[PDB]
Amino acid sequence: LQDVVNQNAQALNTLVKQLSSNFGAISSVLNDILSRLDPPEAEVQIDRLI
């Protein structure tokens, strides 16, 4: 019974932690990319994040 709970918690945790990866962009924070960069260039980073 504990294995199911542990597996689900671990999968959910890694899903959460995958939000902290750049994926080749300039940052992992989308608001930071928007605030620091103009709309024409922001799409390039946003596409990698997507």
Enumerate binding residues for another protein (CB under 8 A). 26, 31-32, 35-38, 41
Cβ at position 23, least distance to another protein in Å: 18
Cβ at position 25, least distance to another protein in Å: 13
Rank residues 13 and 36 by Cβ distance to another protein and give the closer one: 36
Cβ at position 31, least distance to another protein in Å: 5
Using CA atoms, how far residue 36 sits from 4, 11, 39, 45, in Å, is 43, 33, 10, 12
Answer whether 20's CB lies under 8 Å from 13's CB. Answer: no
Residue 12's H or E segment, with its range, is helix 2-17
